[PDB]
Amino acid sequence: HMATVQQLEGRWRLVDSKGFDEYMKELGVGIALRKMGAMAKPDCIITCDGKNLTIKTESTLKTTQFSCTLGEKFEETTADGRKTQTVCNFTDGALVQHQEWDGKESTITRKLKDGKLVVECVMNNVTCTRIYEKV
């Protein structure tokens, strides 16, 4: 019969939201932060342990980086604000992404090495090495 505070425990996904912007205006929150807050579709995570309550928030940001056909050059607009002429190929066991802009070039190689994705980014001298687990 009775609602207890422990029943509120779990992961809650936002499905509907009405009056957010008005309410934020009443608190005196700025336009940019009102809009950004009203956009996000956060998970709410509630934990109650007897009398101790914690509320947390989870936002996942999903971006398509690029979408291409292998061996066909295409214009990429990069997160740092370059417009590159790019082409991805498959040569000698590695996915090679080649970027050209403003007389410059940068390569980004992706390969498997012991069940892990090794990403190697080169620009002039400089290598950035990133490693990922399959999940």
Ligand X SMILES: CCc1c(-c2ccccc2)c(-c2ccccc2)nn1-c1ccccc1-c1cccc(OCC(=O)O)c1
Q: In this chain, which of 52, 57, 64, 124 binds ligand X, going by CB under 6 A?
A: 57
Tell me which residues in 21-40 interact with ligand X (CB under 6 A): 23-24, 27, 37, 40
To which H or E segment does residue 20 belong?
A: helix 20-27
131 labeled part of a ligand binding site: yes
Question: Does residue 75 belong to the site contacting a copy of itself (CB under 8 A)?
Answer: no
- Contact of residue 43 among ligand X, a copy of itself, none (CB under 5-8 Å per partner type): a copy of itself
In angstroms, the Cα distances linking 107 to 15, 68, 72, 134 are: 42, 16, 16, 23
Instruction: With CB under 6 A as the rule, give the number of residues binding ligand X.
Output: 19
How many residues appear in the chain?
135
Angle of helix 20-27 relative to helix 31-39, nearest 10 degrees, comes to: 150
The annotation places the binding site for hexadecanoate at: 132
